[PDB]
Amino acid sequence: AVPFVEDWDLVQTLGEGAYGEVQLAVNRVTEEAVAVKIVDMKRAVDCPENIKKEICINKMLNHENVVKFYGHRREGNIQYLFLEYCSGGELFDRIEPDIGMPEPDAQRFFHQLMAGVVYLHGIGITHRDIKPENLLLDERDNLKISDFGLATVFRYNNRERLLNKMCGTLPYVAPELLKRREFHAEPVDVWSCGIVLTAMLAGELPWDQPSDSCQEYSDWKEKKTYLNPWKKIDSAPLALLHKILVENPSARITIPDIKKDRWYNKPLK
Ligand SMILES: Cc1cc2n[nH]c(=O)n2c2cc(-c3ccc[nH]3)ccc12
Q1: Is the CB of 83 under 6 A from ligand 1?
Q2: Rounded to whole angstroms, how far apart are CA atoms 61 and 218?
Q3: Dihedral, CA of residue 100, residue 145, residue 163 and residue 193, to nearest 10
Q4: In the annotation, is 189 catalytic?
Q5: What number does the ligand 1 atom closest to the CA of 147 have?
Q6: Is 22 touching ligand 1 by the criterion CB < 6 Å?
Q7: Regarding domains, what does the record say?
């Protein structure tokens, strides 16, 4: 940090990651911008192992819809991760509250989200916290999946394992996390992508959590798409959401079948 901070301006805070605060750093000579995630390992006894794992997963990644990882180093009890600066900001800030964004924009972002998730799943990694705060944008509005603090390996070579950790952000979590002791990784990420699509199209999360005790979730199970947020969503993308937000993960649409969906393939304005 010492010589680094002589040559690089830590201009401002960008946000909070799973494991630490992220700063914009700009080199005074070249004006290169990088995002620096600063992780205080004293915040938990397991933080050193947890951040080591985030680093390890980052080293596996190379895809146009995933935030680039440049490197890392430790200074005392602080770990520094050096990440792509995504100058388009968070997808969250393209969503007008209670309105969403135009359907063509939501469709394009959703295609890019699928590309990134397909990539991750192909290498056996699940993100586990997909939400608009963790979907950044570059200078050409290309989506970049961000923050692998909660990510884990669900397939070792061609051998899947079940997961059991209740992690993620509650309004985005799939119902099987509240019902099953162990579950498949991929349908959990598919579900959160559906909640992201809902938010992009209507500017509103549909429920606190996907429990039968949550009235808004019961309303969706009972096909009450005449209520918000659903009544704001056109029938074509709503038909896709009906296939994604399926309670039984075994019956839930898979990404290869999302690719065949009418709305997914629909030419928009
Ligand atoms: C939390 C976070 C992590 C991150 N890693 N790389 C990045 O650019 N960011 C971020 C960038 C922004 C941003 C706001 C405006 C332009 N950009 C915000 C948060 C992050």
Answers
A1: yes
A2: 38
A3: 20
A4: no
A5: 3
A6: yes
A7: The autoinhibitory region (AIR) inhibits the activity of the kinase domain.
